[PDB]
């Protein structure tokens, strides 16, 4: 079963080091975790003060996705209007992927920004609705997979280089980038010999879960255009989720 | 998209 070619190893190293350089709290996220107090976000009689809280919490997270994409030579070799479309498409998916790998079954929490443990209820009643369940259930299943930095990174790049996004000029350039990443990812999987059976199809199904998460936000934002003016949220949140 | 465009530069 084929393992990485030399060109794929160089590609694996580029994307891994871009991930590692932009992953919040690198590896000292394990003990920089402060748990959001149970007072913010439980069942209603959702609260607009927890929604605003999360809106400021997610803005560093978006910034780190942009930095991740700018560290890919392939991503930079693209017209600016394509970069914008690609980033808007994959931002939520990558952030949800970065939170879901930091799932802890003891506390049943994800950690945001390498620092903040939240529960399924806090995120749900803080604005995310069913998407909260989708990210946690994703977190619970990924525990089996033991994904390392390289695999997460490759996942991010595959999400990032989605050539099916509306408005893209160089659909074919994107698609041959994504297929480089896809081959590289599959061969690395082959080399790592995870004990889980049929790891690669099971992974392909998790990408779809991520794409589902990313695509539920033409729903969960009209969730919160109803009660407030636009000026209350940080500019960068509004630009990615509009 | 002004702020995204600035960041991507
Ligand atoms: C999905 C994800 N992720 C992250 C995140 O940082 N993940 C780890 C990382 O990127 O390193 C967040 O900080 C999030 C914050 C809020 C959020 O939902 C909401 C956003 C706005 C309003 C209500 C909920 C989802 C996040």
Author numbering:
A (entry chain A): 211 to 255, 264 to 460
B (entry chain C): 741 to 749
What does the paper say about this structure?
The thyroid hormone receptors (THRs) are nuclear hormone receptors regulated by endogenous thyroid hormones, including the inactive prohormone thyroxine (T4) and the bioactive hormone 3,3′,5-triiodothyronine (T3), which are critical for development regulation and metabolic homeostasis. As ligand-regulated nuclear receptors, THRs have a structurally conserved LBD that allows the binding of distinct ligands (Burris et al., 2013). Following the ligand binding, the function of THRs is mediated through the selective recruitment or release of specific coregulators, like the family of steroid receptor coactivators (SRCs) (Li et al., 2003, Jin and Li, 2010, Savkur and Burris, 2004), as a heterodimeric complex with retinoid X receptor (RXR) (Putcha et al., 2012, Kojetin et al., 2015, Mangelsdorf and Evans, 1995). Although the defects in any of the processes in thyroid hormone transport and synthesis can all contribute to RTH, in most cases the disorder involves defective thyroid hormone receptors, resulting in reduced T3 binding and disruptive thyroid hormone signaling.
As expected, the native ligand T3 abolished or substantially diminished the transcriptional activity of four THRβ mutants associated with thyroid hormone resistance, V264D, H435L, R438H, and R438W, respectively (Wakasaki et al., 2016, Nomura et al., 1996, Sabet and Pallotta, 2011, Narumi et al., 2010). Surprisingly, the treatment of roxadustat either enhanced or retained the transcriptional activity of these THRβ mutants, all leading to higher induced transcriptional activity than those of T3. In contrast, the binding of roxadustat resulted in higher Tm values for four TRβ mutants than that of T3. Although all four mutant residues are located in the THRβ LBD, H435 is the only one that directly contacts ligands T3 or roxadustat, whereas the rest of the mutant residues are located outside the ligand-binding pocket, not in the range to form intimate contacts with the ligands, which makes us wonder how these mutants influence the ligand binding. To unravel the molecular basis for the RTH of the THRβ mutants and further their beneficial susceptibility to roxadustat, we performed structural studies on the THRβ mutants complexed with roxadustat. The structural analysis further revealed an apparent conformational change of residue H435 on helix 10 of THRβ for all four mutants, resulting in the loss of a critical hydrogen bond between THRβ and a critical hydroxy group of T3, which is also conserved for the other THR ligands identified so far, explaining the severely reduced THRβ activity by T3. Specifically, in addition to the direct mutation of H435 to the hydrophobic leucine of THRβ H435L, the allosteric conformational changes of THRβ H435 were coupled with several intermediate structural changes, predominantly in helix 10, which were initiated by mutants R438H, R438W, or V264D, consequently leading to impaired T3 binding.
